[PDB]
Nucleic acid binder design. Structure first.
Length: 544
DNA sequence: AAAAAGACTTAGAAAAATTTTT
DNA sequence: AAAAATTTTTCTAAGTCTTTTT
């Protein structure tokens, strides 16, 4: 049970389509064409992505054109037979014009819309869950557009229809004021289910999946489950040795389904690979996980680049982000891999006889609610602890220590597989300070020089101030030099996500406090708000 | 025991808000 | 001023895990 009471206003529905200006033409074969509304609209979607590689892709265009046709009248259908003959140059230019316009418009325009946004947020961004007014994450309904699937996505480009009240299921308490659908509309169903956390939902027409409107991370419900998310991790931390020495003895099992299991778990532990749930054929870009590694995903090298018993991984993961790695592995694992690989086609799954369900079934058997995913949280978290505990120079300055935090962070966004000429502007700027600082130092030189002979005071104070100047510059300078060393070290690293989902805020908080570092120099309004729990309840001496 | 359905989390892209550079 | 480069924020695709169920 997630609540007893729940009341919201519903979702902001996407705004009505605004027909193009009369002077905004479209053509098919150089022939100006007036498009029916539903068709004009769909064309505008493509028009707004014209300067995006998406529009150059086959699948993208194939999918787009077909669904577009579907929104065509019989006449237009008879006419517009191919996308290549269409010309959105005018439409695209417009929209681009419109954008520059926003980008430059009256500040008067700016404040007025932010207000427009704020009230809207005041009116729809909240719900009342139980005894408190809570905040909604995704309150605005997904606008109709074109499906942008990651990777070589088969259905990329299809049209996402315009969601209607009649597509919307509303969830709330039997005792709540039921949001009134828009004038002239009805909901799909008004349900009261207190076992779920979502307030609204509908089914998406492209992958037939359910989309829900849930609460902001800052919610008691969210943050609660989040506090629990790290706990279990700490709990696994407690039983890891066992588990390790458990799956390792399973490598020797008399049953291959088991050996597969323990080995899968080995990679998930060691490598941080994800569970690897079987995906539905054709709905998305082919990607694989630990459990779904087709033999073609691994290569075994008795000896490689020096190390022995190497397992090379080369496959795409969630979002098609590539995974390449050569891992010297345990002898028993190497040897269990060949066996899992014998008499198999490349396309055959490495751990057939094994599944995500089995895996987690076994895990929760070892520790309550211990799932494949937990391993990643544990590994990440405990790493930030050690790394910080390791990189943080006791006698550094806030700036540098911040660099130390970041450094620690990378080591973490790195295992989790999270993935220019900026240096030209910096270094020049650095040089400025170095020279300013230099010349200022020249000032103190004399300042202190005048001081030897005039031990008065007026003099001594001038030295006092010339010194402050040196200090401020060295300051600015140190900062600069840091940004630099930072930027470089962080070329391909993605820390925003590790920071948002795999790292116990408490560790950070615990750090910031001990090191006298303001959380504000490490989290954004957003992160602080989400991690409000941790912040408030974290001892300087928190140990994960 | 299984699997299809449903629910909740993660994650990069994208947007917008901001700062900084021209 | 404007635009380029950063950062905070928003968006929603892509996954993991649960839950229903026959």
């Amino acid at each position: 049970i997630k609540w007893k009471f729940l009341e919201h206003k519903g979702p902001v529905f996407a705004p009505p389509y605004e027909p193009l200006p009369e002077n905004v033409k479209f053509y098919y074969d150089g022939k100006v064409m007036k498009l029916s509304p539903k068709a004009e609209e769909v064309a505008t979607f493509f028009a707004k992505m014209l300067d995006h590689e998406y529009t150059t892709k086959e699948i993208f265009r194939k999918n787009f054109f077909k669904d577009w046709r579907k929104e065509m009248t019989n006449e237009e259908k008879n006419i517009i037979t191919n996308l290549s003959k269409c010309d959105f140059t005018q439409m695209s230019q417009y929209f681009k014009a419109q954008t520059e316009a926003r980008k430059q418009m009256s500040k008067e325009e700016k404040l007025k819309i932010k207000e427009e946004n704020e009230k809207l947020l005041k009116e729809y961004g909240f719900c009342i869950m139980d005894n408190h007014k809570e905040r909604i994450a995704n309150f605005k309904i997904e606008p109709p557009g074109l499906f942008r699937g990651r990777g070589n996505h088969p259905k990329m480009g299809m049209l996402k229809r315009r969601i209607m009240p009649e597509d919307i299921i509303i969830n709330c308490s039997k005792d709540a004021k039921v949001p009134s659908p828009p004038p002239g509309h009805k909901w799909k169903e008004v349900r009261h289910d207190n076992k779920v956390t979502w307030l609204v939902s509908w089914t998406e027409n492209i992958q037939g999946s359910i989309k829900y409107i849930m609460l902001n991370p800052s919610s008691r419900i969210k943050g609660e489950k989040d506090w629990q998310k790290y706990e279990t991790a700490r709990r696994l931390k407690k039983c890891v040795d066992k588990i390790r020495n458990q799956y390792r003895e399973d490598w020797k099992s008399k049953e291959m389904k088991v050996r597969q299991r323990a080995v899968a778990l080995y990679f998930i532990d060691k490598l941080a690979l994800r569970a690897g749930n079987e995906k539905e054929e054709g709905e998305t870009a082919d990607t694989v996980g630990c459990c779904s590694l087709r033999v073609e995903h691994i290569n075994l090298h008795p000896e490689l680049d020096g190390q022995e018993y190497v397992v090379e991984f080369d496959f795409l993961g969630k979002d098609s982000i590539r995974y390449y790695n050569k891992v010297p592995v345990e002898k028993r694992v190497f040897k269990n891999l060949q066996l899992f690989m014998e008499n198999k086609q490349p396309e055959d799954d490495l751990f057939d006889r094994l599944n995500t369900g089995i895996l987690n079934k076994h895990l929760q058997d070892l520790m309550e609610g211990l799932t494949a995913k937990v391993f990643r949280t544990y590994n990440a978290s405990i790493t930030l602890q050690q790394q910080l505990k390791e990189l943080t120079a006791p006698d550094e300055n806030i700036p540098a220590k911040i660099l130390s935090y970041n450094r620690a962070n990378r080591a973490v966004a790195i295992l989790c597989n999270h993935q220019e000429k900026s240096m030209m502007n910096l270094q020049t700027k650095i040089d400025a300070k170095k020279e300013q600082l230099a010349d200022a130092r020249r000032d103190l030189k004399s300042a202190k020089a005048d001081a030897k002979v005039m031990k008065d005071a007026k003099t001594k104070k001038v030295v006092e101030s010339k010194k402050k100047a040196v200090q401020r510059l060295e300051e600015q300078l140190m900062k600069l030099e840091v940004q630099a060393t930072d930027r470089e070290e962080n070329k391909q690293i993605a820390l925003g996500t590790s920071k948002l989902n795999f790292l116990d805020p408490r560790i950070t908080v615990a750090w910031c406090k001990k090191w006298g570092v303001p959380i504000e120099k490490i989290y954004n309004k957003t992160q602080r708000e989400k991690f409000a729990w941790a912040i408030d309840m974290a001892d300087e001496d928190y140990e994960f």
